[PDB]
Design a protein around this ligand. Structure first.
Ligand SMILES: Nc1nc2c(ncn2[C@@H]2O[C@H](COP(=O)(O)OP(=O)(O)OP(=O)(O)O)[C@@H](O)[C@H]2O)c(=O)[nH]1
Ligand SMILES: Nc1nc2c(ncn2[C@@H]2O[C@H](COP(=O)(O)OP(=O)(O)OP(=O)(O)O)[C@@H](O)[C@H]2O)c(=O)[nH]1
Ligand SMILES: COc1cc2c(c(OC)c1OC)-c1ccc(OC)c(=O)cc1[C@@H](NC(C)=O)CC2
Ligand SMILES: [Ca+2]
Ligand SMILES: [Ca+2]
Ligand SMILES: [Ca+2]
Ligand SMILES: [Mg+2]
Ligand SMILES: [Mg+2]
Ligand SMILES: [Mg+2]
Lengths: 69, 426, 440
């Protein structure tokens, strides 16, 4: 009985211990995947500013080449 | 704590922008000198939102004034509130754009855009927590449209997490005979679909028709048209400028008004609209949803509402307001999309506007707005089929392909509006 | 010491906390400055009211509470309000920008900036506790802070405090009471994220309290103050057992063990009786058996649903005031004879009862009349699934077209979290059907 009374408390500790780690780990990846996702959503906006600026320069070049009279 | 930075470009943008400041300064008890001469403490509880606190108990609009023709710069200084504006924030060119979108967007406006961003950056640095920008401009001109849309992109580039709002005026043959206006509007709409979070469609055809038919103004002027604009602009910003049980900002408005990123073109409305030669809450409610009171030349009963926001102003029975918004909603159930539950919210403000005991301002995201874009697309295709005046923009370095891209994108926007207009719950 | 730390998150949670701590002070005789003349145990003590209040050497009784909001407007009123010096500056936490009705902003974007600070202040309160019992978390489903940051906080609290009790008080949205179009999304996301971290959640349908205030109290057009004062009566009844000494009161552990049959089925339906105005209370007294019967009338539930069409799994009846055991036992005896009140067949004994002889207290200004016997019933009924169903339907209408979803993806979320959260809700609805089915 003593041996069983002690398996119980040691198991109860393990219950609480794994509760913490299923929470620490699940919250860990949710913040990881959210970091990546917003980094991608901001890395895509670094490519639209790049293309928008690049096209503006192509326009200003075309004006330049049209002044050659 | 939630500061908005106002920018206004072009002639139209500055005239309506000036009236906006001539209308809300009175509501907040600020005279042209910038001194507070009000009675209620509620006028100042959110003075920050649009005004900077200066030494000597002075209030200065957080406004940036722009145009490529320096003449309009002096016109504002001569205005009733001309001297309230911070003189450093006047950024003007020397040539003007001649109703050329390319000049304002790519060549001449580009040479001035950086000088404006410096004024934008200075005002932003003195904000406790910048909540967004608002632009007032026309889409048919050359500067407010071409340079205004360029500015939006550059501000979005530097402030990607700030909300971009605009009060965009688009052309109507009834108010302007300039021929290339469909080009400037179509080209600017191509930008606004991508770089603004929420845009109010101030349609000059709707403003003319309201002035002529409803107000009985055989001869309407920009002052008559701008009176409707200032009243609308005062209404849609009432909850940003005054406190209450709402406590909302520009991002909350966008979050709850825009179900899909591209469909952010609103359809303002105002009530009452009555002639000088001639009110109950149920009458406000009915007229507010009437097509004749819309600032966009569209019939909401030709489409369906995705979302709606109604702001009631003046001291009135709260329960009477809630009952009537229920009555109008279920009596118009068909014109509200069934797949967005509770898509009509109502805010109420005790302070009425000048000269009225009660006011109602309407902000609707309706699929009927497509009627506007179809009107411009029809005009655009008429000139673009024959390349009329196209050399104006090619000479500045543009490609005919960019014209078709702006055309097709606006045509796509019409399709998307029609897509969700026909959508069913099951 | 059996202390309890209150956490008030977002506008609703803060404003609901304002009404609760106001009431607590009135029930315990604590002045707005924190001084309590009747307390002779200066600087400390083992009194029951010390479970919610800490003492300072200067005789100042300080709430064991943390107020967090991502924008300062609401909590600023507390900092300048009538109870400004009741709290400590460290306990009133605010950011500069709110979550903008976006769960994602409250959970991922604006929340992260402040979450580590909030835990530290909660940590500071915990270190002052000798026997911390659990956390009480007040928040709305609809707001971006109340939904997104609360979820973040609950997850973090499970890591830093393990299985320590965490109870919620949640405001279920309603069109009547200043709701927003995306609030169904926030409610589903926060419920799914918090299901596995909360041991007992007390939803309050804002439409139900709107109706009670508008009907029982003859308030044509209720305010948040009218609603919060009513909510505080339920919160007070639940925590009275902890803030007051008594031989027949129900502590939190006793409270949770007798009301939650399965971990996920932990959403009791709250009722309060009598909710009555002064004009009606004039020359009118209601008895123990009368207020006991009112608890089972669907018209008084804090959440709109029909217990008559569902099954009870456990009932907790917290009496307070001039209530005697004999009347309590007779009133409950009658309820067990009523075939109109059906218990599941696996709940042969389904009543937890308690009495707190401290009389109900009314805010001087609060529409409730001062009564002498009140009862708050908290019942785990399957009917509560009706509230989940209504909200789940609104989620489906919008999500079928992916309306508004872009606002959440822009802040880093994936559509997978939307469907996952919806599937969890579907399992919960099926769970409530399974527990209601008769046994073999
Ligand atoms: N409602 C309203 N519309 C105006 C006003 N002023 C000009 N417009 C409209 O604006 C269009 C022309 O654009 P403008 O703003 O004048 O041109 P701009 O922005 O100054 O650019 P550029 O003239 O090319 O330098 C016309 O279609 C007018 O109908 C005004 O005060 N109120
Ligand atoms: N009962 C009650 N409900 C409230 C109160 N304040 C807000 N609510 C509810 O909360 C919802 C709005 O969310 P809030 O809690 O105000 O928003 P928040 O937590 O501050 O988060 P943000 O989005 O950042 O503003 C509405 O649906 C209301 O029904 C209140 O004082 N009492
Ligand atoms: C700028 O101040 C405003 C801000 C907002 C709103 C609004 O219209 C009433 C405003 O007045 C201009 C608003 C928009 C409508 C919504 O649904 C379409 C919603 O749920 C959301 C509402 C507002 N929330 C409530 C409960 O009214 C928040 C966003
Ligand atoms: Ca004209
Ligand atoms: Ca003591
Ligand atoms: Ca003391
Ligand atoms: Mg000009
Ligand atoms: Mg808030
Ligand atoms: Mg006991």
């Amino acid at each position: 009985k003593r041996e069983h009374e002690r398996e119980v408390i040691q198991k109860a500790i393990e219950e609480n211990n794994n509760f913490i780690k299923m929470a620490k780990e699940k919250l860990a990846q949710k913040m990881e995947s959210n970091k990546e996702n917003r980094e991608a959503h901001l890395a895509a906006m670094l490519e639209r500013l790049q293309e928008k600026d690049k096209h503006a320069e192509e326009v200003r070049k075309n004006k330049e080449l049209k002044e050659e009279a | 704590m939630r500061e908005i930075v106002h920018i206004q470009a072009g002639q139209c943008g500055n005239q309506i922008g000036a009236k906006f400041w001539e209308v809300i300064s009175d509501e907040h008890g600020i005279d042209p000198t910038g001194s507070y001469h009000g009675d209620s403490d509620l006028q100042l509880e959110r003075i920050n939102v649009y005004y900077n606190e200066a030494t000597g108990n002075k209030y200065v609009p957080r406004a940036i004034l722009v145009d490529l023709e320096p003449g309009t710069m002096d016109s504002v200084r001569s205005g009733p509130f001309g001297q309230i504006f911070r003189p450093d924030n006047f950024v003007f060119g020397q040539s003007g754009a001649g109703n050329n979108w390319a000049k304002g967007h790519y060549t001449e406006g580009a040479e001035l855009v950086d000088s404006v961003l410096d004024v934008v950056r200075k005002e932003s640095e003195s904000c406790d927590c910048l909540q967004g920008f608002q632009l007032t401009h026309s889409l048919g001109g050359g500067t407010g449209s071409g340079m205004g849309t360029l500015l939006i992109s550059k501000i979005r580039e530097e402030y990607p997490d700030r909300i971009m709002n605009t009060f965009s005026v688009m052309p109507s043959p009834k108010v302007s005979d300039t021929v290339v206006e469909p080009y400037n509007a179509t080209l600017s709409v191509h930008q606004l679909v991508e770089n603004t979070d929420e845009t109010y469609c101030i349609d000059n055809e709707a403003l003319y028709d309201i002035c002529f038919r409803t107000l009985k103004l055989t001869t309407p002027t920009y002052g008559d048209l701008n009176h409707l604009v200032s009243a609308t602009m005062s209404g849609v910003t009432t909850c940003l400028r005054f406190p209450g049980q709402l406590n909302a900002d520009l991002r909350k408005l966008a979050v709850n008004m825009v179900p899909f990123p591209r469909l952010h073109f609103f359809m303002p409305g105002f009530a009452p609209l009555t002639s000088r030669g001639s009110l109950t809450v149920p009458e406000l409610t009915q007229q507010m949803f009437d097509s004749k009171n819309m600032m966009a030349a569209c019939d909401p009963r030709h489409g369906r509402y995705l979302t709606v926001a109604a702001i009631f102003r003046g001291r009135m029975s709260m329960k009477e307001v809630d009952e009537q918004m229920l009555n109008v909603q279920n009596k118009n159930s068909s014109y509200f999309v069934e797949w967005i539950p509770n898509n009509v919210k109502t805010a109420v403000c005790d302070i009425p506007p000048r000269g009225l005991k009660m006011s109602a301002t309407f902000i609707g995201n309706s699929t009927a707005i497509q009627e506007l874009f179809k009107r411009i697309s029809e005009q655009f295709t008429a000139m673009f089929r024959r390349k009329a005046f196209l050399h104006w923009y090619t000479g500045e370095g543009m490609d005919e392909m960019e014209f078709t891209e702006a055309e097709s994108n606006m045509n796509d926007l019409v399709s998307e509006y029609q897509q969700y207009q026909d959508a069913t719950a099951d | 010491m059996r202390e309890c730390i209150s956490i008030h998150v977002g506008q609703a949670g803060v404003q609901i906390g304002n009404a609760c701590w106001e009431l607590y002070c009135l029930e315990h005789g604590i002045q707005p400055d924190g001084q309590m003349p009747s307390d002779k145990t200066i600087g400390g003590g083992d009194d029951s009211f010390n479970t919610f209040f800490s003492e300072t050497g200067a005789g100042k009784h300080v709430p064991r509470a943390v107020f967090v909001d991502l924008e300062p407007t609401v909590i600023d009123e507390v900092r300048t309000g009538t109870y400004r010096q009741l709290f400590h500056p460290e306990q009133l936490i605010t950011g500069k920008e709110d979550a903008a009705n976006n769960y994602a902003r409250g959970h991922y974007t604006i929340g992260k900036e402040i979450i580590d600070l909030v835990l530290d202040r909660i940590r500071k309160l915990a270190d002052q506790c000798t026997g911390l019992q659990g956390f009480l978390v007040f928040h709305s489903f609809g707001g971006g802070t109340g939904s997104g940051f609360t979820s973040l906080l609950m997850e973090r609290l499970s890591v830093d405090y393990g299985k320590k009790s965490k109870l919620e008080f949640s405001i279920y949205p309603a069109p009547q009471v200043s709701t927003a179009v995306v609030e169904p999304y926030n409610s589903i996301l926060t419920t799914h994220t918090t299901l596995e971290h909360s041991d007992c959640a007390f939803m309050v349908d804002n439409e139900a309290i709107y109706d009670i205030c508008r009907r029982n109290l003859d308030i044509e057009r209720p305010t948040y103050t009218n609603l919060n004062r009513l909510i505080s009566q339920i919160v007070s009844s639940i925590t009275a057992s902890l803030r007051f000494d008594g031989a027949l009161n129900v502590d939190l552990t006793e409270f949770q063990t007798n009301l939650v049959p399965y971990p996920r089925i932990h959403f009791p339906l709250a009722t309060y009786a009598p909710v009555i105005s002064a004009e009606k209370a004039y020359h009118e007294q209601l008895s123990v058996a009368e207020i006991t019967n009112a608890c089972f009338e669907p018209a008084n539930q804090m959440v709109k649903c029909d217990p008559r069409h569902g099954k009870y799994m456990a009932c907790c009846l917290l009496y307070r005031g001039d209530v005697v055991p004999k009347d309590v036992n007779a009133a409950i005896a009658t309820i067990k004879t009523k075939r109109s009140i059906q218990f599941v067949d696996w709940c042969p004994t389904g009543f937890k009862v308690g009495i707190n002889y401290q009389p109900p207290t009314v805010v001087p200004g609060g529409d409730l009349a001062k009564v002498q016997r009140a009862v708050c019933m908290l019942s785990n009924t399957t009917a509560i699934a009706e509230a989940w169903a209504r909200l789940d339907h609104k989620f489906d209408l919008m999500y079928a077209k992916r309306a508004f979803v872009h606002w959440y993806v822009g802040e880093g979320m994936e559509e997978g979290e939307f469907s996952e959260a919806r599937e969890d809700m579907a399992a919960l609805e099926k769970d409530y059907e399974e527990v209601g089915v008769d046994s073999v």
